[PDB]
Design a protein around this ligand. Structure first.
Ligand SMILES: O=c1ccc(CN2CCN([C@H]3CC[C@@](O)(c4cccc(C(F)(F)F)c4)CC3)CC2)c[nH]1
Ligand SMILES: O=c1ccc(CN2CCN([C@H]3CC[C@@](O)(c4cccc(C(F)(F)F)c4)CC3)CC2)c[nH]1
Ligand SMILES: O=c1ccc(CN2CCN([C@H]3CC[C@@](O)(c4cccc(C(F)(F)F)c4)CC3)CC2)c[nH]1
Ligand SMILES: [Ca+2]
Lengths: 612, 612
């Protein structure tokens, strides 16, 4: 958060140029002074600017062709001297004129034995939202981003190497994927692949990995580059037989499927959270693969885990409602009419000839709680500890919720074995978080799927937009009613005797789920009737109806994210089950190879009407 | 509200022209009669019209070129005689033909030694919504508004002065800012500045103030002239270094910032209430200045005042709920079962070894109530007494609400020191208006900011559209139920015994926050069951559901004013805090001068991708 140090360096650049006389003469076409300043005075050859540059840079930066040519004749050594500051490090004079994208200077600058393999690092060239650009490092890539393809044929002639990575790791092909000018950068991608004379007996320049470990085809998948993803597909598929308006292709599918030992394409589209990245699930190779792996091979394995889970909690609620109880002995009721306990649960009463079935009842549900923690907790020691806060948009808060369920059921084993007294406090949390976690199996069924991803967008966002302003009005008005019934016997209107209940009975009246305090035999204090009518004119006629105004306004301008988030949620179920189920189940989708003269990669086909 | 006197004068103008024969001959091209009427008769040279005009005016008003030329030859003195009425005062014959915007008369009228410095005052030329025009006063400005630029080069040749103000104070440059024809009046603004040969060793004709104290650049800011605000910015900025698609400018910022001793641009955009004026907060110099002064330097100073205020009311509610009480002695209960008081608060009981902490409790909250009135009440003796009713749309009703809070807490000091009896009546107002005034700190946080400016648009407007028709149905039906339970013992159905409660129990049933009167052991009067079912068919199924129909219809057609009013509300917090905080805090945003050869004004920079 110190961009002011970057803002200081730019404004220091002018004042240094205003100081020296020939840098002003390099800023403009003051070529009359360039004949004088080098012939008459001395030693003004190697002084630097504010960010450590030469007069050759400044004439290159403000595209002054006439002044740059005289300075090269004066001392043909300034091309070898790069910039030296920490923002612009190593950036030579060739790099400046190529970004200006229309120069005949590069034919005159490379004529004086200029270098093409200069290392242009620095902090204004690495990928970050602080910069507005990402040009890579090499001048081959500098021409590749501004789309001056006349320069590229002239720069590749003098020894420019294609396969050149950088300090971040990506190649020249990867820079073309990451541009906002998507439309006619695709026409340049045909050129950079075409200047590949030999494959160097290794990977043929389209499969090179970076340090972050991606191919250029996969990198189109993560950043959501839709239009470039189509032209990359054109090398993979090949048509088989055309028959009038009916045609039939055969997609390659060696890289868009999870068959492997490491990352795939369907793994990374779910893992990223870019809004544009989840539109590749609508194009023709990916949609056919995910729907063939879900109408079969995925859905009866999803409802087999459906019915096993529903027969877990029903064998748990039946274990819950039969708690071992007795009458309340040896603790006879000391306060009068203010305690109403009469059970005081058992501790050593699993020796009874009915209770042997309930011993099975805990033994079933506590074996499953071991299996829950041994199927999710080993996914945050192999994976990072922030991925539970990382997949939270798509399929995330249920993985928080199932961990907390099994941690509560293990508490009630600890307390009952040690014979504790307070017992229903975790066991009531272990029965809401059970039955509200069968909510997770609503993403499978359509007509129940855009109604779970809607309420996830609503319990965050809009209701947290309201629960503050709900807990600001009621937190005050409860303190207004608790003053006003200090002068009142709680035998009538017992809604306010303790401030811990007055804060409750205001919240329970704010939603109109109590009637409202009225006795009608005795009178009321006079200030009550005014400040309660000011509550109703806020609570039931302004503040609560403004939910339905916001529920009805949100629910149609996320009605297109709704039906798309369900499609991305069906894939996070698809990739997760294939990774955890073994290999006898889930045969790999598609027809295999090494039988029909194709190779070892396994294919898929799709056919469609051309529509003429 | 007497436009009929203005309507009378226009219709009197025709009948006077119908009377005299040569004014009809001036109304048309009756030039045959003009050869006769001046040669044959006498003395018809100086008679006036209804609004005091000559025959030269009438031939100029209906653009009759032939009749105007003969009348100038007859007596070359009529050009010096202006109009003389109270509507059209001093308006000479040159002024009429210039408004018609296409005349060669002005070359023939200025040929006879016409004056250019005529003072055209009057009540139809000053800026008001009664007029439909605002032309200024000088004929240089008359040509400047109708955009006849061929006249302007011909009128400036004969001695027209540019720097000429009027009775309101504004200049010729200011008239071009206030036109509805915004698009190609900008192309005329280049001409009027270009005829400035010398700067007169003073301000160079672009910084002149009026009597209301504005520059032409600021006057574009107040009236919301968006397209003219762009071309005015073009003289202030100057580019620094262009680098491919990345460019980097340096805005001037000596006039769009509150650094001074008086008004600035950001002061006046909030103060005006013009709907178009709050769109200048989206253009590139103003948005970058307000967001840099809010991500830093403004937001932790806004939440430092956040947490200090929340630890004020919690140290006040804790002071509230511990009121000094006792049992109700010496006033034993005289009415039976109709009074239920048993406390009767203390008056001289701050001498007790627990109560010394609560003496700190009042002493904290009553020092702050002095500080509230000594930080807001001196903003309506220096400023006007109508600005609390003047900033009410943007950041206004909270400044009403914080004054009323501190005035109520000072009441409960007066009553407790004088040992009064009625005590909870202002102290309950001092606890709703406390906790509902921490609502004011919801404009700072996004996702809580379009939900406070929404409810301000709703407690006014739509709920005052409904609270009348709510208090017309219930005011009658309560009088219908209070008749019908005159014949009823209040021991059962005690919802109606006094008309002050029947008016309450109808309002509390109109929102369905009581059940509804039913006993079901004894019967009811028969007319009750009909006229109460006619209440429910209005109160819960027609009249109250029509809120949600209006809440759901308002909340999407102010959904663009919603997210814009929040941006203007963040600026009224920004300008206000910088004006009241001292100078060691809030350093002025941007890089300073007198170090880099620029001057003494302090600059800002911004850079953006050109997008080619
Ligand atoms: O004392 C209590 C009683 C009940 C609780 C229950 N929690 C835990 C779970 N959440 C509820 C709310 C709605 C629920 O469908 C849900 C949770 C998370 C995500 C979703 C989603 F919308 F994504 F499906 C739904 C379950 C129970 C919130 C309160 C806590 N503490
Ligand atoms: O090109 C266009 C674009 C937009 C349009 C008009 N919209 C905008 C309004 N929409 C909906 C918005 C919400 C709406 O259900 C609703 C109104 C009031 C109350 C509710 C409820 F209370 F039920 F939530 C819903 C009406 C129209 C329909 C299309 C026409 N033509
Ligand atoms: O006896 C009583 C008891 C309580 C009251 C409360 N008033 C005073 C303050 N306003 C309420 C309504 C909603 C509230 O957020 C608000 C007020 C003003 C402006 C806004 C805004 F929308 F601008 F934030 C909100 C505060 C309490 C109206 C009624 C009056 N009289
Ligand atoms: Ca109800």
């Amino acid at each position: 958060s110190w961009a002011q140090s970057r803002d200081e360096q730019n404004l220091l650049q002018q004042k240094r140029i205003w100081e020296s006389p020939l840098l002003l003469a390099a800023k403009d076409n003051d070529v009359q002074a360039l004949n004088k300043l080098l012939k008459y005075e001395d030693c003004k050859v190697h002084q630097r600017g504010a960010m450590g540059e030469t007069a050759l840079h400044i004439a290159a930066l403000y595209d002054n062709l006439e002044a740059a040519m005289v300075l090269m004749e004066a001392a043909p050594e300034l091309v070898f001297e790069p910039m030296t500051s920490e923002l612009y490090e190593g950036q030579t004079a060739l790099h400046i004129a190529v970004v200006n994208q229309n120069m005949n200077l590069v034919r005159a600058l490379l004529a004086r034995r200029a270098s093409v393999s200069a290392r242009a690092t620095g902090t204004a060239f690495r990928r970050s939202p602080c910069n507005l650009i990402y040009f890579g490092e090499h001048p081959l890539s500098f021409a590749a981003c501004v789309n001056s393809e006349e320069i590229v044929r002239l720069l590749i002639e003098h020894g420019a190497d294609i396969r050149a990575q950088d300090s971040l790791g990506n190649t020249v092909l990867h820079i073309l994927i990451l541009q906002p000018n998507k439309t006619f950068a695709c026409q340049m991608y045909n050129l950079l692949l075409s200047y590949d004379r030999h494959g160097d007996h290794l990977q043929p320049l389209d499969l090179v990995p970076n340090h972050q470990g991606l191919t250029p085809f996969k990198l189109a998948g993560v950043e959501g580059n839709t239009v470039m993803f189509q032209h990359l597909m054109q090398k993979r598929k090949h048509t088989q037989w055309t028959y009038g308006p009916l045609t039939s292709t055969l997609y390659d599918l060696t890289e868009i499927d999870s068959s492997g030992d490491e990352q795939s394409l369907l793994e990374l589209i779910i893992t990223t959270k870019k809004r544009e990245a989840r539109q590749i699930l609508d194009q023709t190779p990916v949609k056919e693969l995910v729907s063939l792996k879900w109408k079969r091979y995925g859905r009866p394995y999803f409802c087999m885990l459906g019915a096993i889970y529903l027969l877990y909690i029903i064998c748990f609620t039946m274990c819950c409602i039969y708690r071992p109880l007795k009458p309340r002995t040896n603790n006879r009721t000391s306060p009068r009419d203010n305690t109403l306990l009469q059970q005081k649960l058992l501790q050593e009463a699993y020796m009874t000839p009915k209770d042997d079935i309930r011993l099975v009842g805990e033994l079933v549900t506590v074996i499953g709680a071991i299996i829950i923690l041994l199927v999710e907790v080993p996914d945050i020691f192999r994976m990072g500890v922030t991925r539970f806060f990382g997949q939270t948009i798509l399929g995330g808060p249920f993985h928080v919720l199932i961990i907390t369920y099994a941690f509560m059921v293990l508490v009630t084993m600890v307390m009952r074995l040690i014979s504790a007294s307070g017992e229903v406090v975790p066991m009531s949390f272990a029965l809401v978080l059970g039955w509200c976690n069968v909510m997770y199996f609503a993403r499978g069924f359509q007509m129940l799927g855009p109604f779970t991803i809607m309420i996830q967008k609503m319990i965050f966002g809009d209701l947290m937009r309201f629960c503050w302003l709900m807990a600001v009005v009621i937190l005050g008005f409860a303190s207004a009613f608790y003053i006003i019934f200090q002068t009142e016997d709680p035998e009538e209107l017992g809604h306010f005797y303790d401030y811990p209940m007055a804060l409750f009975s205001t919240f329970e009246l704010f939603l109109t789920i109590i009637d409202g305090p009225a006795n009608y035999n005795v009178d009321l204090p006079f200030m009550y009737s005014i400040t309660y009518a000011a509550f109703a004119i806020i609570a039931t006629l302004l503040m609560l109806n403004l939910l339905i105004a916001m529920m009805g306004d949100t629910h149609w301008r996320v009605a297109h994210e709704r039906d798309e988030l369900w499609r991305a949620q069906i894939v996070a179920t698809t990739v997760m089950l294939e990774r955890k189920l073994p290999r006898c189940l889930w045969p790999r989708s598609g027809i295999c190879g090494r039988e029909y003269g194709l190779g070892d990669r396994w294919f898929l086909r799709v056919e469609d009407r051309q529509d003429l």
